DNA sequence: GTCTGCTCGGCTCGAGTGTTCGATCGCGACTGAGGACGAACGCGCCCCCACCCCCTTTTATAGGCGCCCTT
């Protein structure tokens, strides 16, 4: 969560879309949100 | 005198209320990351400070050069 963090959004997003993610988690770009939904990932 | 019925008391069970504990949610604080501002260093441009050429005078010396106009 920590590292999760200091992913600096735009790293996230990439991952975000690496995963499989949906466009729209992706598009809205809440940072907060795109790390909950990473993490959410990560743990699934 | 005996038997039977009725009433009262005691005990047990069930229900309700209260208290305690656990879990979840919200708020606050701390830490980390990102962005902005300031300072320092480096590079580029501009201004200055560089230059050895010119210089008028003197003197000795002398060939090439004029010129000098009178016969």
Same mark, same amino acid.
């Given at each position: *969560?920590? *590292? @999760?963090?200091? @992913? +600096? @959004? &735009?790293?996230? &997003?990439?991952?975000?879309? &690496?995963?499989?993610?949906? #466009? $729209? $988690?992706? &598009?809205? @770009? +809440?940072?907060? #949100? %795109?790390? *909950?939904? %990473?993490?959410?990932? +990560?743990? $699934?």
């Amino acid at each position: *969560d920590a *590292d @999760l963090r200091r @992913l +600096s @959004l &735009k790293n996230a &997003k990439q991952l975000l879309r &690496k995963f499989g993610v949906p #466009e $729209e $988690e992706i &598009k809205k @770009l +809440s940072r907060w #949100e %795109v790390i *909950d939904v %990473v993490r959410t990932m +990560s743990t $699934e």
